[PDB]
Scaffold this motif. Sequence first.
Motif, PDB file in Angstrom:
ATOM      1  N   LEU A 183       0.933  -0.999  -0.022  1.00  0.00           N
ATOM      2  CA  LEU A 183      -0.056   0.175  -0.009  1.00  0.00           C
ATOM      3  C   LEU A 183       0.784   1.438   0.131  1.00  0.00           C
ATOM      4  N   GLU A 184       1.982   1.147   0.529  1.00  0.00           N
ATOM      5  CA  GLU A 184       2.994   2.462   0.463  1.00  0.00           C
ATOM      6  C   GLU A 184       3.185   2.829  -1.110  1.00  0.00           C
TER       7      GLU A 184
ATOM      8  N   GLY B 263       0.550   4.902  -2.294  1.00  0.00           N
ATOM      9  CA  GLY B 263       0.355   6.182  -1.953  1.00  0.00           C
ATOM     10  C   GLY B 263       1.039   7.096  -3.107  1.00  0.00           C
TER      11      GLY B 263
ATOM     12  N   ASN C 101      -0.337  10.050  -5.972  1.00  0.00           N
ATOM     13  CA  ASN C 101       0.010  11.498  -5.846  1.00  0.00           C
ATOM     14  C   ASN C 101       0.748  11.923  -7.385  1.00  0.00           C
TER      15      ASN C 101
ATOM     16  N   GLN D  42      -1.865   3.483   6.243  1.00  0.00           N
ATOM     17  CA  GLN D  42      -1.691   3.767   5.082  1.00  0.00           C
ATOM     18  C   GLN D  42      -2.985   3.533   3.927  1.00  0.00           C
TER      19      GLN D  42
ATOM     20  N   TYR E 175      -4.662   7.117   4.122  1.00  0.00           N
ATOM     21  CA  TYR E 175      -4.121   8.304   3.653  1.00  0.00           C
ATOM     22  C   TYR E 175      -4.637   8.438   2.176  1.00  0.00           C
TER      23      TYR E 175
ATOM     24  N   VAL F 206      -8.095   9.709   1.147  1.00  0.00           N
ATOM     25  CA  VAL F 206      -7.994  11.415   1.540  1.00  0.00           C
ATOM     26  C   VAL F 206      -7.161  11.899   0.371  1.00  0.00           C
TER      27      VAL F 206
ATOM     28  N   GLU G  39      -8.691  14.372  -2.481  1.00  0.00           N
ATOM     29  CA  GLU G  39      -8.255  16.060  -2.526  1.00  0.00           C
ATOM     30  C   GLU G  39      -8.100  16.118  -3.951  1.00  0.00           C
TER      31      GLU G  39
ATOM     32  N   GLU H 127     -13.696  11.431  10.270  1.00  0.00           N
ATOM     33  CA  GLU H 127     -13.352  12.831  11.049  1.00  0.00           C
ATOM     34  C   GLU H 127     -12.264  13.397   9.953  1.00  0.00           C
ATOM     35  N   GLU H 128     -11.638  12.785   9.579  1.00  0.00           N
ATOM     36  CA  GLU H 128     -10.349  13.358   8.715  1.00  0.00           C
ATOM     37  C   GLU H 128     -10.952  13.827   7.519  1.00  0.00           C
TER      38      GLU H 128
ATOM     39  N   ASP I 278     -12.522  17.765   7.256  1.00  0.00           N
ATOM     40  CA  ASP I 278     -11.480  18.857   7.404  1.00  0.00           C
ATOM     41  C   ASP I 278     -11.322  19.220   5.940  1.00  0.00           C
ATOM     42  N   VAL I 279     -11.495  18.487   4.787  1.00  0.00           N
ATOM     43  CA  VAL I 279     -11.292  18.898   3.661  1.00  0.00           C
ATOM     44  C   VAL I 279     -12.487  18.992   2.920  1.00  0.00           C
TER      45      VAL I 279
ATOM     46  N   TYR J  26     -13.903  23.407  12.102  1.00  0.00           N
ATOM     47  CA  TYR J  26     -14.687  23.498  10.877  1.00  0.00           C
ATOM     48  C   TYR J  26     -15.971  22.525  11.034  1.00  0.00           C
TER      49      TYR J  26
END
Lengths: 400, 176, 95, 146, 87
Positions: A201-202, A205, A209, A242, A245, A248, A252, A285-286, A289-290, A330
């Motif tokens: 999974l790393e 990530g 990106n 992981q 992340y 999210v 984004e 919850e995370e 914030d976006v 927020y």
Amino acid sequence: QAELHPLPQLKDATSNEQQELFCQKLQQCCILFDFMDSVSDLKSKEIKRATLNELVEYVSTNRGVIVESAYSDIVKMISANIFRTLPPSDNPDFDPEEDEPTLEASWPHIQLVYEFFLRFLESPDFQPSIAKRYIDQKFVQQLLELFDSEDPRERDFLKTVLHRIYGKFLGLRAFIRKQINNIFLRFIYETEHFNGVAELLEILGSIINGFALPLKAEHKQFLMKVLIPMHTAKGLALFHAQLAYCVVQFLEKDTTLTEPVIRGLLKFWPKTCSQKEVMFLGEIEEILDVIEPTQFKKIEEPLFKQISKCVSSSHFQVAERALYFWNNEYILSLIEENIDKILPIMFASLYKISKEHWNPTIVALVYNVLKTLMEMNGKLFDDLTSSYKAERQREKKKEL
Amino acid sequence: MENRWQVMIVWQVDRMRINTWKRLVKHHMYISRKAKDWFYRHHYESTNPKISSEVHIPLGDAKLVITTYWGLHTGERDWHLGQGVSIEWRKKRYSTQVDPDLADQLIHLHYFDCFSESAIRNTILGRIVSPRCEYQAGHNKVGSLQYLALAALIKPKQIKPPLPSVRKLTEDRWNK
Amino acid sequence: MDVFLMIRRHKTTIFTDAKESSTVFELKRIVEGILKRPPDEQRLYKDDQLLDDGKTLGECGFTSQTARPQAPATVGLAFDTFEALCIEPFSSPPE
Amino acid sequence: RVVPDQRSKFENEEFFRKLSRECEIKYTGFRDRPHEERQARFQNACRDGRSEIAFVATGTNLSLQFFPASWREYVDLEREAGKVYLKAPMILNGVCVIWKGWIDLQRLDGMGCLEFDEERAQQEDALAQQAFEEARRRTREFEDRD
Amino acid sequence: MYVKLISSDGHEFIVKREHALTSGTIKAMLSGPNEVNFREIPSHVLSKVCMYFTYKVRYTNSSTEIPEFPIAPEIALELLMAANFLD
């Protein structure tokens, strides 16, 4: 076990016959002197170890050491050791969290070949086109199966190899991406004996990106078909950090995916595991914030209905995190705008817990929640608490 | 008689920088796994109900705590300066606030890669330089002429996402 | 604020600091204090514009942003009565 | 006697030269409500020990925050009626210092300055001072042993 | 109050004694064990290193918006040799 006469070191060797000495050493160390035996080949191991130790020095030192004619020998050298037959698991019911990790027998010599591989892929020249013919789709295919290993130390070294291949080889990006999707699709619904997915999974990530904007249809199907159902994993306790992340970070990029993600998140909600829900609430919850305010206008009913269900829990930790929701900045800003619709759902449950729970600490936070809603259009609270008490009078009529 | 208080230095920042910091710290704590001994602390563990998060960084037998704060001055108005940051260094109940330009310097001692002892010597005869620096925010001072010359000949790479910086966090730009 | 100066002739140079509103007398006093040769027997030099005893940086147009501790302003030195502009350039890389 | 050297560094240090050289400060309140409401809220916060207080350099990023000790300093108001006096001990960059300020509630701005605090240096601990000095004296470059 | 520096090429500079204190080698050569000759050192490398002396003394312990100190890539190997010799 033919006698290994110590050939002159490449430092002593002149410009001529340097590759011939280099190539001969590679064929010299291509042998498979096994380390399972407790005491055997007491002299053959160290000279092999010394040559590999000197070999790692040879690649790091100088620049024109690597030539095109040597390319075949290095691949044969590396593939003879790393492409081994993986030992069977000591215990089929082995617990990665509880039982101690299993070690590797040939590790003292394996530590050098992986180092040899690493300093080779990072070589100053490393013309990929020359290596394109030699490092083909077949080399990568057997490489992925090596992630099934059990030694934690090997996985970290193995991962850096895959990233180096993907970042330099522009031809197999489609294959490794498709392979990555294929290998994950097995892990969602199959026997699922894979243990290196945390390291796997790393890589995912650092591949998202680089996902260019706007998205493509192939990348769109990644979320709803692979990543989201992965939360149903039995061993999420080790992969969640992981896994959280990438959800999210992917969100984004295209914010229009927030609605499918939240609804998809609510579909596979935990049912009977207390520890599963605690980390699951941290996922939602995370996201908040976006989140965009407009996208909030579509998930007030389903998302907040679940939160009003989890506050009336039989475990303190599940209720503890949920009660901390009314502490963010927020989150409170969003719930002020749409107070008219959020209030009728929670307030029936927030008032009930006020005078039934035993632990004062949970009750103490509840008072802060109820007082917080008094810092709003409290006429609706007054309209509620006048009507709500009548519904509790209606409940008093139920008592009557 | 007036009550007792504690006084802090808090740098007022906007939430976009705060969430970017959270994203960068998490990515380099978990995904690339360069900073693995760092700790990230959620808001629900400190008595003060304004702390948004805490980051603890072991430095040998000492530690460095960077704390972020949520709405201060908030309430209607707007969110140009909703959050705040503070940095503290504590050892045996002793504490002192530290400037960010020094906080970043202290982090870099027990962490990422820099030139080794033989990098300078090997540069002379071209016997390849390794490891090479990847964190240029940790050399904000002048330092010896050797480092400046060396950094010229091998321009350091760029981490895919930016390396986490205490300095990018605490910068006004609004007022300039 | 302060600025840094270059004076070049033959095979000698000086690196020095001074204040902002200093006109020309502070620079001339320092080099007097360094060359042990009486002061007025000199002329500063910039481009081709003549330099006077009471000229000042602001009047001269030189500013703090012109001279930085990385490329100080160059003006040369002079002393028997008068000499030419022997601005010998530095060495060059072997190419 | 390294505190005198630190104080001497006043001219040459960023972090005594950006917040201790006579700079105008203002109380940063709600900033939205009308002026009389702002004064009322500020005064109520000054009496009550349940709130937050913010100080801006009027033009920078630096702010001073006073938190209630529940979450030798004081906020005196009777002295010099129509003024609030602020005293705040601190330890900055390893040297113990005292912050003294005053705000006029009519205009919600005033003056602050920073001064050195004597006596309060030898009682805490010599080892922590020396340790911090040694830590800050190190350089990463060419330090690692391969 | 001023130390004289002679370039191996044939150039001579002079820089205050205080400014020279920031380098270890010349201090060891002079403080304890006048004239100092930096043999092999070209003229331009010596000029650049001395400019670095001025820069460092000006921008020492102070930490502000101090600017970068440019070094053209073509002039790098000899500056590194000089720095290693002097530091």
